[PDB]
Amino acid sequence: VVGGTEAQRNSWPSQISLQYRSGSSWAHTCGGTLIRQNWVMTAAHCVDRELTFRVVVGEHNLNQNDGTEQYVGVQKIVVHPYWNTDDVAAGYDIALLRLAQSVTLNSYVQLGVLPRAGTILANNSPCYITGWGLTRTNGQLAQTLQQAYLPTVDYAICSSSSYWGSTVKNSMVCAGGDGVRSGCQGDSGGPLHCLVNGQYAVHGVTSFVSRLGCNVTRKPTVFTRVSAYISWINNVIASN
Numbered sequence: 137v138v139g140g141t142e143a144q145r146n147s148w149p150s151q152i153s154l155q156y157r158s159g160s161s162w163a164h165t166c167g168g169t170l171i172r173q174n175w176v177m178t179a180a181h182c183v184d185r186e187l188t189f190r191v192v193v194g195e196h197n198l199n200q201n202d203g204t205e206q207y208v209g210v211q212k213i214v215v216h217p218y219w220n221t222d223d224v225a226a227g228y229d230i231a232l233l234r235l236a237q238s239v240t241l242n243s244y245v246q247l248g249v250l251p252r253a254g255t256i257l258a259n260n261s262p263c264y265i266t267g268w269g270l271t272r273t274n275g276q277l278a279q280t281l282q283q284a285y286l287p288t289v290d291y292a293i294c295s296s297s298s299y300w301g302s303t304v305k306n307s308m309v310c311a312g313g314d315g316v317r318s319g320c321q322g323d324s325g326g327p328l329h330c331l332v333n334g335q336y337a338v339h340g341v342t343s344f345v346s347r348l349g350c351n352v353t354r355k356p357t358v359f360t361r362v363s364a365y366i367s368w369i370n371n372v373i374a375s376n
């Protein structure tokens with residue numbers, strides 16, 4: 137997250153760190169949202185690789201013991217069937233991960249609430265992106281979880297020529313684009329938390345940014361629109 141602030145450790149308990157095995161260690165690669173004690177929602181682009189993954193819940197600092205973490209392996213991965221790795225702009229950037237064990241819930245570990253199917257936010261709706269992604273374009277990952285306020289940019293504005301044009305589809309949510317704040321590499325797969333009727337819900341799964349950089353004016357961060365996938369998510373959890 138570029139231009140973020142450190143999140144309080146109990147503000148976003150559904151946020152998880154998705155990591156892969158690298159040598160004798162684990163490397164953070166993406167964010168994700170805990171949706172069931174044994175299921176995590178992330179981006180397809182985070183797991184369409186030949187790696188061994190684990191999820192860390194109750195994670196605040198990737199490099200220090202927080203004393204609240206639960207480390208769990210990923211048992212099964214279900215990527216959206218229309219996903220195409222070399223065509224993120226087509227959409228379908230979503231995947232569900234079934235965990236090897238069910239995690240224990242507490243103030244640092246909670247299920248993320250998803251919007252009702254079809255829900256679209258009004259332009260400039262208040263949301264926060266969270267994650268450990270780069271803190272600057274071509275920079276380095278954050279050690280502590282960061283958050284940045286990114287109000288939404290509706291489909292009509294987002295798909296206009298000075299914004300993203302037709303690269304953005306109606307199955308996506310755009311947010312930010314102020315040139316200072318944004319998601320960045322390593323934030324992909326994580327949540328876009330939006331406040332609606334007093335409660336935060338995860339309306340987006342971080343998917344992509346501009347080729348020019350993370351925080352680019354009029355190139356808001358783009359997310360898979362969760363509300364376009366409620367039936368898909370329900371179908372997967374039920375058949376697995």
Ligand SMILES: *C(=O)[C@@H](C(C)C)[C@H]1[C@H](NS(C)(=O)=O)CCN1C(=O)/C=C/CN1CCCCC1
Pocket residue numbers: 181224225269303319320321322323324325342343344345346357
């Ligand atoms: C996730 O971290 C994203 C954004 C949110 C930073 C990032 C990831 N790239 S990487 C180097 O961490 O593997 C996954 C894809 N991604 C992108 O920004 C992809 C952008 C690609 N463009 C191609 C042109 C059409 C729009 C998307």
